[PDB]
Structures are given as structure tokens and as C-alpha cells.
Amino acid sequence: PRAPRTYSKTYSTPKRPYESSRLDAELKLAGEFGLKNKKEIYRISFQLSKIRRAARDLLTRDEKDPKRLFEGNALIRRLVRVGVLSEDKKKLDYVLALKVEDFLERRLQTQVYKLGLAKSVHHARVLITQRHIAVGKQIVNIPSFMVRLDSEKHIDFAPTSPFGGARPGRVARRNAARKAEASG
Amino acid sequence: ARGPKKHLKRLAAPHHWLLDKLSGCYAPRPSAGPHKLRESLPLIVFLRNRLKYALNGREVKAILMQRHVKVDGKVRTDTTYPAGFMDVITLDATNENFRLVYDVKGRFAVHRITDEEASYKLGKVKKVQLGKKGVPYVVTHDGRTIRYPDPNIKVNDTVKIDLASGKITDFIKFDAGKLVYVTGGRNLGRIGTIVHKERHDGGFDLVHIKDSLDNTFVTRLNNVFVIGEQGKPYISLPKGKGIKLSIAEERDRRRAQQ
Amino acid sequence: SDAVTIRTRKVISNPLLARKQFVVDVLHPNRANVSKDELREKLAEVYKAEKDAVSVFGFRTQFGGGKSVGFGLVYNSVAEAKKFEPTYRLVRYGLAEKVEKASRQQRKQKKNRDKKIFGTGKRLAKKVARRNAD
Amino acid sequence: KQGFPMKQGVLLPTRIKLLLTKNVSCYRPRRDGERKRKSVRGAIVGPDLAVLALVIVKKGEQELEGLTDTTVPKRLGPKRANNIRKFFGLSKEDDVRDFVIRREVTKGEKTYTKAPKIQRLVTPQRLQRKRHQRALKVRNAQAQREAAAEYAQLLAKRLSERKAEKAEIRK
RNA sequence: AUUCAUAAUAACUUUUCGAAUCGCAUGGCCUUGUGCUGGCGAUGGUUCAUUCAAAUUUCUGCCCUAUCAACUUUCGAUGGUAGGAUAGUGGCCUACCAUGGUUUCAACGGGUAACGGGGAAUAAGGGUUCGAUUCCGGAGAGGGAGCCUGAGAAACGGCUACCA
RNA sequence: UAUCUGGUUGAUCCUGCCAGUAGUCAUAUGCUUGUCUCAAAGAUUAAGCCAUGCAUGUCUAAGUAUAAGCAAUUUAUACAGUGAAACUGCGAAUGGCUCAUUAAAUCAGUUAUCGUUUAUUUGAUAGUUCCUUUACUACAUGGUAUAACUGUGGUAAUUCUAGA
């Protein structure tokens, strides 16, 4: 038969599931970033854990080791390209300093909210999932879509959406028909 | 298994064919031929996966059966004919021309060739012997059998074979300084110069090689292929003249070519 | 389609099958999609060939509409196209007709039934008829 | 009864099993090398039979209609050249391309005689192949002989050059 | 490294092979005849070589059990020599002979809810458990044996017998 | 991300296990159920038993075709195309399934064939084919059979087959 299609999990549920401090902290993140489940928090924390593990390995590696330089350069480059890290904090230890709120801040939800297209983060998520936002020029409706540090210049309303200059939607169009019929 | 094997599955196939892992379950099992089942590029993969001149096994069979493809000097129609290291694949219909050769990563390059160099090939004799009626003869790594070779030739020297008629044209002897092309192991695709050999009794022979960057390495003799004198090959070389860059150097070159 | 401006990339020529093959994309803003006929006629006129001589397939409409990408294959003659394309694609293009082979199970049943008969069986048919009458 | 054929050679009036093999009657091997345990009745005639197959080795003095009285043709005429030759009693030089049986066949009103092809027929193509074989073999022999001569001269020159090298040695 | 490659002598062989095959193309030469020569191939064929293999084989490594301590040697056990046999090494088998071989560094025997590996899960480090299963290698077609064809089979979507 | 917590006591410090917690390309099951991608799936007990239907056949220009087949010899009186059937050559010994048997067995890494066989592919490679030794040889090519087919049959029945 066929070669196996590989797959893996993207999150790690916590040990000690019921620390009241962690539950309160993660709900604060969920409320202020408009997340749907704790799964998102777990995924970002799993992601941050993976990056921090790699960065710790490479930071205890000897200086100007070929492996350290190559791997560290790649790690920081994708970090700054996604924009989670910042070019002033170019050194490797700043990755250890990173927190889950930083990745959440670069999620598509919050970038739409920060660019002002959204009334709030929850209004932002509704807008994203209803195919009204677009990056580059293409409709994207994954709220977790990471935005590179160059695509903020392209995030705005989708050309197919009524908020992007397209056809006047469905319910407005239906209500317009009703108004014309009632005036007819 | 109570007979010869007649199938190959993509995970079993050698990696240096760069076959993808999710396009069907089976792989083209290179039919018996002049080269090993490994270290041999079938025409099916060569045309479809490297040149992209045909998208299907069906289309590749069409190419082969209209005889636009001829390997070395002879027209071949075996869809999985095992073209090997030094094989010259002609493609006269498009007036293309290639010689198989390894890039420095260890994969058969798409190295195009000119006709004055497609008319001939190199061969590292794997043994010298006496045939019947007292005829001394040699066989190359390609299985090509050449009678009455030059008596100064020994094993593992290099023959220059004409595709018009397989015959001794000249030979390069295996000693220090000769340019070598490492065919296999962890240094597959490397090019360098011999500095000296070990000559293990009974054990595998070993030769130490240093190249133009002085990135010396060591490789078994069953794995080397002398192809000319210092910095002057008997063929053209693929991209980069067999130099291997570090991972850092490769990233730099990609960034500089961006 | 409005502002198709069909673009063709990687246009490598193969004299082996005597055609030009390229990765084709079509931009169709404000329209759902473009079809085989509308793609083939435009490709035919831009490549200086008959409508049948050019073949296109593998069109995946990219998310949000707007554009799709398929694979284009323009032959050097109608005869070349007839010889080289698969019969499914020809009948797809409408040039050819669907082969009337029976289903696999009925077809395989025929093989195994005729496998039980050695030779023509004309003598056997006569003998079976004589015995059945008897 | 039950239709078991009476095998030739088996000397008993009963039904017996045999591991019937190729080139033997009563059984046709479906796969090469195959052997099957069939049942065959003996060659000794007995009451068990339902039919007896008889062929007349000398005709009586009165006629049977389904017999000597009437005849059927040899359905096919000879197809090999020499078999045509023996059938017509021909000599060495007699032609066969015109003694082939032009057996008639009429597809509706379309009549024609599709006569058998002739095998082993002397034809210039075969002579061309034979002469080509002769030239091929003699060419190979000549080429092999001349190449052996060249290497012999080369090895002789190698001997001379080594002798000159030893002359350079030894002062 | 060889009694190797290969060559040379004397014979033997119930004798293998060395082409009575096939398609296209039909060109040259004249002493013009169905004359002599001719191309591109396909198929086939001995030996060598290659390739795909195959069979043996060196070394090292395997879970639990002493409530298994001695085991193997009738009629193969360890080995010698000679022969059969094998495609071929070999107690593989036969014949004569010697009395050896393994073991507390766990032989031998029993259990395995045991196909082996690449690997999987989970771990600071060490590790613990799992791997029937997509790849590799084994073994089987209900049990067991025997065997035809072939290059390749103990073949089972092949035969033979017994068993169920 | 090298972490512990509840339980023996009136109360304490311990050994100590029970319980908790988290993971499982780890099984089953309960409740519940919108979408996309991907996707395992009669291994576990029974390598227990199997109805039925399929799963190995195959032809080009290039082995043999007078089907009493099809269209035409618009190329032909030996064949000329195409083609059923059939003989012939290959293949059916790969794949697919399962893990029952097997604890130095398999398998893993590593070896050797100076110890053997190998269809096929690849490359070479038969003046001695007069050999009983120049007609055993007709060499512009030798001989024999038998399928396919026709016709008579037998058996309730088989992918049975006899006689001519």
C-alpha cells in the first residue's frame, strides 16, 4: 500500500489541569484576544515551547559553532519575518523572553482589529470567517493566519465582499427587493 | 520469494531519484541492464521527473516507442532502461543532449552536453581478464566489453570509449594527482585529486582526496572514478565543478542569487 | 469571461510529442469560472492553431474565486493531437466517442465463461443441441 | 456408461484410475507439466460399454450408406511446398505456386479462391538472408583476424620498447 | 593468495552448439539470367562478462524460567579419509575409524498471551514499555508430505496421496 | 516543559503503598454531533469454516491462419488487410494477504564465494556445420507428424473427452 501520510498534534494540554492562577490568566488572554477555546492558548503555548526549546538548545551551544549559527540564524529570521520578534531585539536570548501574548498579537484577528477595520476582536473574527478580509489581494478566512511583517500593507477588505466594493450582499439585497415591492 | 523480484515500492526506491512519496504506491523497477538497480536512472524517471517532457508513464512509453530517445549510441525503447553514471542520453529529435553525472549533493544532474562530447564517454574498468582463444579484454562499469585493450591498462583505470564503436581510444592511469569523481558513499558527487592510497591487503582500498578548496576527504577505491588530469577533466563537469559548500555557504549563495 | 487575459508560463517545447506545453492561469474576476471551450478557443487563437490542436486540463479554482490554474498543451497538428491525447480527453473535448466496453464485472464474466470452452465450440453447440433434443 | 473412454493399453475390463500425463490420450493438460488422476475404462471389451468405435479394415460385399458407399473430402489441401509436390507427384522443377488448391468461397455474390499460403517456399528473400548470413560471418572473421594481427604487432612493439628501456638500464 | 585466468598434449562423449526463422526495403553490377551482390532490423544461439538474483557463509547481538544441571553419542553426536549427492561447500548422505562436542561466562529442557528489524509512546540524564500492521527480510495457503514444467516452485487462485 | 497533591494520627515526623494528575499513529464503549483537509479499519478471540462474483493472461510489421469470419484483393492466382479459434513462445515463481510456526532460528549490522547456479537486460563472442572427416549435404533448403477445423459419439453432471 501507499506510503504513510504523516501528521502530528499542535498542542499540549497542561499538567495540573486546575491551577486557578493559570485558568484566570488564560481566560484573560482568551477574552482580550477573542479566542474560541483554550485549545488556541494551548497551541500557541505549545508553539512557544517548541521555539523556546530549540533556542535554549542553541544558546547553550558553543559560540560560532556552525550548527549554532545556521540554526540560530534561521530561527530568528522566521521570527522577525513573522514579526513576533522585533529587529531591535535581534539577539537569540530575546526568543526566550517571548511570551504567548506576542504570537497572539500577530494573529490575524488582532491585526485586523489594530488596523482599525474591526469594531472589536470578536467583530474582527466574524469579519474574517465571513470572507470579508483579505491579505495580499486574496480572501483569507483562517483567523489564526499569521501575518508576515510585510503583509500589514495588504490587509484590508476583500474585493469580493460588500465592504470591498462588491455586490450589495444578500440580506440588504433581499430587503431592497422588499422595499421596492412594498413601494410597487 | 521464490524467484526474481519484479516490483519496487516508492519507499524502497533509491532516494536520489527524488521521487515523491505520495504519487502512487509503486516505483519504476529498473529492468536488468548495464548498471546496478541502484545508482541507475531509468528513462521513465529521467524524462518524466527531470526533463518534464512527458507527464505520464503512458506518455513516456510513447516517447520511447517512437524512438526519439537513444542512450549511448543505440536506440532504446525500455521504459525503465537503467541509464547509469556515464551514459550519454541523446534525444536527437529535439537536438538535445545530456550526459548523466552527479551534482555535489549526490543526485543525477540534468547536465547537458555537446555532440563532440556526446560521441564519447569515459569508463572505469572493473576488471581485466583473458577471454577465449587467449584474448585479453576489459569490462567497464557500464558492462561494455572491449577486446584487445592497451596492455598498459590495469583495473580501475579509466577508458575513453567511443559510442560509434566501443573501443580503447586512450586511458588515464590511476596514480597520485589524477582528477577523480566520487561515485557513491557520503561524498557522492565530489571531485578532487588523489594524494595517496592505503592499499589494504584484503581490506577495502582507500584513497585520500583533496580538492581546489583543500576540503580533503577519504573514500573507498571501489567508489572513485578518475576522469582526467589536474583541473582538466576528460568531459565537462556539472554545475560548480563538484565543489561542496557548507550549509552556511549554500544559504549565502541562495541569498546572493535572490 | 471579463478580463481573462489568460497567461501562460513555463512554455517548454517538446518535439518528442511535437507540442508546446505550459502552465496556464486564467483570471476571471466577477465571473464564477471559465470552461473548456472558452479556454481552448482563446488559447488556439493566441498560439495560431485550430481549436482542437490545443489541449488544457487540471484547472483548480483558487480560493476566493478570481483565478484558476490549469495545464495547457498545444499540439503541432490535429493529427498529432488525435494520436497523442488519451481517448478520455478526446471524448472530453468532444472530438471522439466513448468506447462501448461493457462493465468490468460483465466483461470479466465473459472471460471466465469463454475460458471454460476449448476452441470455437461450434461442434459442441451441435452436440449439445442433439442431446437436448434426445 | 458414465462416458469414461476406453483407454488403449490398459489390460482389464474394469474402470481404473491413471495419472494421465502429456502425449497420452484421454486427458489434455491445462497447465504445462500437469498430471491429473483420471478414470479410464480398460481396453478389454465388455458389457459395460454404451458405444464401440469401429473402423473397417476390409470392405464387405454389400454397402452401408454412412460408409464405403459415400465419401467426404480431405477438407484441406496441402499447405507446405513439398507436401504439394508429393500430392501431385511432381518432379524437382515443377512449380507449386500454381498447383495450390484455389478452394472457392462465395461471400454472397462475391466469389474468390483464397488458396493456402505455401511454406518452405524457395523465394529470393530467403536467398538474400542466407547470403547476408554468409557475408556477416566472413566479415566478422576478417575483422577479428585483422584486429588480432594489430594487437600482436602492438604487443611486439611493446616488447621492443621494453628491450630499449632495459638497454637504457644496465648502462 | 591459488591446481586462477588462459594456452598446450592424448584420447572420450549414448553428444551440445555453431541459424532449413520472420517483417520491411528493394539499391547496385553486368556476361540481362527470376544471375551475382545489397540495407534497416526482428527472432534465435555457445562461451565469457554485466545486471536482476539465488544458495550457503565469518563475527556480534535476543524475552521469562535451576519448581529445567548436566546435555549430544540406538539408528550422526564432534572429527578424519574415500565415495555418492548437490548447481555448489558440508556428517548433506554412505562406509571404515578415533572418542569426541556444548555447559554455572546458564549448555539442555519448559513457557512465550514471541515473526525479527527500520521504528512507536513517554522521559532532565539514565531508562520503561510497545512494534500483528503501509518499508526491508523471513514463513504459510487447513495439517503433512511428495513431485511435474521451467531459469526460478516443495508453487497450493499447480498436480499426487493421507488426514479433517 | 528536572514540579507533585488527598489518605494511617487527638496532633507530629517517617517507611509505605492506595488514590489523584498528564500522555498514548492504544483498544473498546457511552453520550453528543455543523464544516475543510487527511485517514486507520476482522491483528488481538478462531492460520475457525466459507455460499456467490471476480483477482493471470498475453501479439507486433516482424512464428504458424484457405474460419466453410469481416471488408476489400480498386496490391496481386500461392500469401498479402483485419481477425475469431487453435498450435507455438513467454508469464503465471512478481504482486496481494496473514503472522500459525520459529528463542542462535529468524532478523540487524558486518562479511566471503579462491565455494556455487542464474531465465532475462547489457556488452562482446562460433571459416574447423565434409568430421562416420568435400557431398551423411536438396542447399534455389531436406523429413515427419499433430492441433485448429469437419463429421459420428458416450456421460445427470466437470474448464471430461473417444473413434475417423
Short mmCIF file of C-alpha atoms in Angstrom, two decimals, chain B residues 3-254:
data_model
loop_
_atom_site.label_atom_id
_atom_site.label_comp_id
_atom_site.label_asym_id
_atom_site.label_seq_id
_atom_site.Cartn_x
_atom_site.Cartn_y
_atom_site.Cartn_z
CA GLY B 3 12.17 -16.18 -7.88
CA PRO B 4 13.41 -12.82 -9.13
CA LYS B 5 11.74 -9.68 -7.84
CA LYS B 6 9.77 -7.67 -10.40
CA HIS B 7 8.32 -4.79 -8.35
CA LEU B 8 9.52 -1.74 -6.48
CA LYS B 9 7.67 0.45 -3.99
CA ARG B 10 8.45 4.14 -3.74
CA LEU B 11 9.83 3.91 -0.23
CA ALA B 12 12.12 1.11 -1.35
CA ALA B 13 13.36 3.08 -4.36
CA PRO B 14 16.72 4.86 -4.06
CA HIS B 15 16.30 8.39 -2.79
CA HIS B 16 18.49 10.05 -5.38
CA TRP B 17 15.74 9.66 -7.90
CA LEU B 18 13.89 12.42 -6.00
CA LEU B 19 10.66 10.53 -6.49
CA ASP B 20 7.89 11.99 -4.38
CA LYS B 21 6.43 9.77 -1.68
CA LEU B 22 2.67 10.22 -2.25
CA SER B 23 2.37 9.76 -6.04
CA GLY B 24 1.17 6.17 -6.11
CA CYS B 25 2.50 3.21 -4.21
CA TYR B 26 4.90 1.68 -6.74
CA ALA B 27 8.18 2.82 -8.28
CA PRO B 28 9.76 2.05 -11.65
CA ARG B 29 11.85 -1.04 -11.04
CA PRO B 30 14.80 -0.54 -13.40
CA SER B 31 14.84 -3.60 -15.60
CA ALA B 32 18.05 -5.56 -15.84
CA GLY B 33 20.75 -3.62 -17.61
CA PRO B 34 24.32 -2.38 -17.77
CA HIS B 35 24.22 -0.69 -14.34
CA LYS B 36 23.15 -1.76 -10.87
CA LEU B 37 19.50 -1.44 -9.98
CA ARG B 38 20.61 1.30 -7.64
CA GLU B 39 22.92 4.07 -8.92
CA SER B 40 21.00 3.94 -12.20
CA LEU B 41 18.43 6.37 -13.54
CA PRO B 42 15.63 4.77 -15.58
CA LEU B 43 14.47 6.65 -18.66
CA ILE B 44 10.95 6.80 -17.22
CA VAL B 45 12.09 8.94 -14.29
CA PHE B 46 14.67 10.80 -16.40
CA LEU B 47 12.14 12.06 -18.93
CA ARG B 48 9.12 12.49 -16.67
CA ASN B 49 10.70 13.77 -13.46
CA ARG B 50 13.81 15.65 -14.61
CA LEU B 51 13.11 17.00 -18.09
CA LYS B 52 9.32 17.03 -17.58
CA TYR B 53 9.00 16.27 -21.30
CA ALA B 54 6.13 13.85 -20.58
CA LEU B 55 3.73 13.71 -17.66
CA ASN B 56 2.64 10.06 -17.65
CA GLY B 57 4.10 6.61 -17.84
CA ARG B 58 1.87 6.31 -20.89
CA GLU B 59 3.41 9.40 -22.46
CA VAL B 60 6.95 8.29 -21.64
CA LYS B 61 6.22 4.99 -23.38
CA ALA B 62 5.06 6.99 -26.40
CA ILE B 63 8.39 8.84 -26.46
CA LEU B 64 10.42 5.63 -26.20
CA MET B 65 8.41 3.69 -28.80
CA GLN B 66 8.70 6.44 -31.39
CA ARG B 67 12.46 6.13 -30.77
CA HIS B 68 13.21 9.79 -30.16
CA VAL B 69 15.38 8.61 -27.25
CA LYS B 70 18.68 6.84 -27.75
CA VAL B 71 21.08 6.00 -24.93
CA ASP B 72 24.79 5.98 -25.70
CA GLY B 73 24.86 5.38 -29.45
CA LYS B 74 21.96 2.95 -29.57
CA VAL B 75 18.22 3.48 -29.67
CA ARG B 76 16.45 2.18 -26.58
CA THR B 77 12.77 1.51 -26.03
CA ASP B 78 12.77 0.08 -22.49
CA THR B 79 10.60 2.48 -20.49
CA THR B 80 12.67 1.57 -17.41
CA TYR B 81 16.03 1.14 -19.08
CA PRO B 82 18.68 1.68 -16.34
CA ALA B 83 20.76 4.56 -17.67
CA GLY B 84 23.83 4.78 -15.49
CA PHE B 85 26.54 7.18 -14.39
CA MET B 86 28.48 7.81 -17.60
CA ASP B 87 25.61 7.17 -20.01
CA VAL B 88 25.04 9.66 -22.80
CA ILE B 89 21.32 10.17 -23.39
CA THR B 90 20.97 11.76 -26.79
CA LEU B 91 17.40 12.89 -27.62
CA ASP B 92 18.18 13.68 -31.23
CA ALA B 93 14.58 14.67 -32.06
CA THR B 94 14.84 17.91 -30.07
CA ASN B 95 18.59 18.10 -30.81
CA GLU B 96 19.07 17.98 -27.06
CA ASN B 97 21.96 16.10 -25.48
CA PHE B 98 22.91 15.06 -21.95
CA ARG B 99 25.44 13.07 -20.02
CA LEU B 100 24.39 11.65 -16.69
CA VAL B 101 26.51 12.95 -13.82
CA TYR B 102 26.08 13.66 -10.12
CA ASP B 103 25.68 17.10 -8.70
CA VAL B 104 27.53 17.69 -5.46
CA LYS B 105 24.52 16.74 -3.35
CA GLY B 106 24.50 13.22 -4.80
CA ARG B 107 21.82 13.29 -7.49
CA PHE B 108 21.95 12.73 -11.22
CA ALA B 109 22.29 16.13 -12.81
CA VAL B 110 20.48 17.30 -15.93
CA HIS B 111 23.91 18.14 -17.32
CA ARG B 112 23.50 18.99 -21.00
CA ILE B 113 26.28 18.12 -23.43
CA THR B 114 27.62 18.97 -26.87
CA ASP B 115 27.79 16.47 -29.71
CA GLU B 116 31.59 16.43 -29.90
CA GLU B 117 31.46 15.23 -26.29
CA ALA B 118 28.30 13.14 -26.71
CA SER B 119 30.11 10.99 -29.26
CA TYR B 120 32.28 9.53 -26.48
CA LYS B 121 32.22 8.56 -22.82
CA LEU B 122 34.56 7.57 -20.01
CA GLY B 123 34.71 4.13 -18.44
CA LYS B 124 36.45 2.86 -15.30
CA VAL B 125 37.39 -0.75 -15.97
CA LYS B 126 36.17 -3.03 -13.23
CA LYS B 127 38.42 -5.87 -14.34
CA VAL B 128 40.91 -7.00 -16.96
CA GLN B 129 40.83 -10.66 -17.96
CA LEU B 130 41.58 -13.20 -20.66
CA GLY B 131 38.68 -14.31 -22.83
CA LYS B 132 38.64 -17.39 -25.01
CA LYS B 133 41.38 -18.04 -27.57
CA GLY B 134 43.74 -16.08 -25.33
CA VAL B 135 42.05 -12.73 -25.97
CA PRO B 136 42.76 -10.19 -23.21
CA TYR B 137 39.84 -7.87 -22.64
CA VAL B 138 38.26 -5.43 -20.20
CA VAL B 139 34.78 -4.58 -18.96
CA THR B 140 33.74 -1.12 -17.86
CA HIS B 141 31.39 -0.09 -15.07
CA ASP B 142 28.76 0.06 -17.83
CA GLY B 143 29.30 -3.61 -18.69
CA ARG B 144 30.64 -2.64 -22.10
CA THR B 145 33.15 -5.32 -23.10
CA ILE B 146 36.25 -4.21 -25.02
CA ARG B 147 38.64 -6.72 -26.55
CA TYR B 148 42.40 -6.34 -27.05
CA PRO B 149 42.87 -3.27 -24.82
CA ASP B 150 46.13 -1.44 -24.47
CA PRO B 151 48.45 -3.62 -22.34
CA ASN B 152 49.42 -0.76 -20.03
CA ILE B 153 45.82 -0.57 -18.81
CA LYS B 154 45.01 -2.17 -15.46
CA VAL B 155 41.92 -2.42 -13.29
CA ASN B 156 40.20 0.76 -12.07
CA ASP B 157 41.97 2.89 -14.66
CA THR B 158 39.75 4.97 -16.93
CA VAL B 159 38.87 4.17 -20.53
CA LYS B 160 37.67 6.69 -23.08
CA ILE B 161 35.04 4.84 -25.12
CA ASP B 162 33.68 5.93 -28.48
CA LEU B 163 29.95 5.43 -28.86
CA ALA B 164 30.42 4.79 -32.59
CA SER B 165 32.35 1.60 -31.84
CA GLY B 166 33.19 0.67 -28.27
CA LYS B 167 36.96 0.57 -28.42
CA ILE B 168 40.00 1.74 -26.46
CA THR B 169 40.77 5.30 -27.51
CA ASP B 170 43.05 6.23 -24.63
CA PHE B 171 43.35 5.56 -20.92
CA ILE B 172 44.18 7.55 -17.80
CA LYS B 173 46.20 5.68 -15.21
CA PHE B 174 45.33 5.62 -11.52
CA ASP B 175 48.03 7.38 -9.53
CA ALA B 176 48.50 10.47 -7.39
CA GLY B 177 47.16 13.79 -8.61
CA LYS B 178 44.64 12.45 -11.11
CA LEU B 179 41.25 14.13 -11.02
CA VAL B 180 38.66 11.76 -9.55
CA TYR B 181 34.87 11.78 -9.45
CA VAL B 182 33.50 10.12 -6.31
CA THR B 183 30.56 7.89 -7.29
CA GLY B 184 28.83 6.96 -4.05
CA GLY B 185 29.12 6.87 -0.32
CA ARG B 186 28.72 10.03 1.70
CA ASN B 187 30.85 12.02 -0.77
CA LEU B 188 28.87 11.15 -3.89
CA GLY B 189 29.39 13.85 -6.50
CA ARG B 190 32.68 15.17 -5.14
CA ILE B 191 35.63 15.97 -7.39
CA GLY B 192 39.22 16.10 -6.25
CA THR B 193 42.76 14.87 -6.71
CA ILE B 194 44.37 11.79 -5.19
CA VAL B 195 47.16 12.46 -2.71
CA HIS B 196 47.92 8.81 -1.90
CA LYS B 197 46.23 5.46 -1.32
CA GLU B 198 46.29 2.98 1.53
CA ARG B 199 46.29 -0.32 -0.39
CA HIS B 200 44.89 -2.51 2.37
CA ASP B 201 45.74 -6.17 1.95
CA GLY B 202 42.42 -7.98 1.78
CA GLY B 203 40.69 -4.93 3.20
CA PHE B 204 38.93 -2.29 1.16
CA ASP B 205 41.31 0.04 -0.63
CA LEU B 206 41.23 3.66 0.44
CA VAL B 207 42.35 6.87 -1.25
CA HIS B 208 42.71 10.34 0.24
CA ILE B 209 41.46 13.19 -1.94
CA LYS B 210 41.87 16.96 -1.70
CA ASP B 211 40.06 19.40 -3.97
CA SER B 212 40.58 23.01 -5.05
CA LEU B 213 39.25 24.28 -1.72
CA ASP B 214 41.54 21.83 0.12
CA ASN B 215 38.41 20.24 1.61
CA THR B 216 40.18 16.90 1.82
CA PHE B 217 38.25 13.68 2.37
CA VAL B 218 38.73 9.91 2.22
CA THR B 219 36.78 7.39 0.16
CA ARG B 220 36.94 3.72 -0.82
CA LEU B 221 38.54 2.88 -4.15
CA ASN B 222 35.55 0.84 -5.37
CA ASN B 223 33.85 4.23 -5.18
CA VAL B 224 36.18 6.55 -7.13
CA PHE B 225 36.36 7.37 -10.84
CA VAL B 226 39.39 9.12 -12.31
CA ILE B 227 38.29 11.30 -15.22
CA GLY B 228 41.39 13.25 -16.16
CA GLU B 229 44.45 15.23 -15.13
CA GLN B 230 44.76 18.04 -12.57
CA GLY B 231 41.99 20.56 -13.21
CA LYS B 232 41.48 19.24 -16.75
CA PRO B 233 38.65 16.71 -17.00
CA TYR B 234 38.06 14.48 -19.99
CA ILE B 235 34.44 15.71 -20.07
CA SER B 236 32.58 18.75 -18.96
CA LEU B 237 31.64 18.96 -15.32
CA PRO B 238 28.19 19.74 -13.93
CA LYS B 239 27.34 22.98 -12.16
CA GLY B 240 30.09 24.01 -9.76
CA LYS B 241 32.81 21.54 -10.82
CA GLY B 242 31.96 19.19 -7.98
CA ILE B 243 32.64 21.64 -5.17
CA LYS B 244 30.68 21.03 -1.98
CA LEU B 245 29.73 24.07 0.06
CA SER B 246 28.80 24.06 3.71
CA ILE B 247 25.21 24.70 4.72
CA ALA B 248 26.17 28.28 5.57
CA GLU B 249 27.81 28.77 2.17
CA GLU B 250 24.77 27.40 0.34
CA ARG B 251 22.46 29.79 2.17
CA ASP B 252 24.79 32.65 1.25
CA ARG B 253 24.77 31.70 -2.44
CA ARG B 254 20.98 31.44 -2.50
#
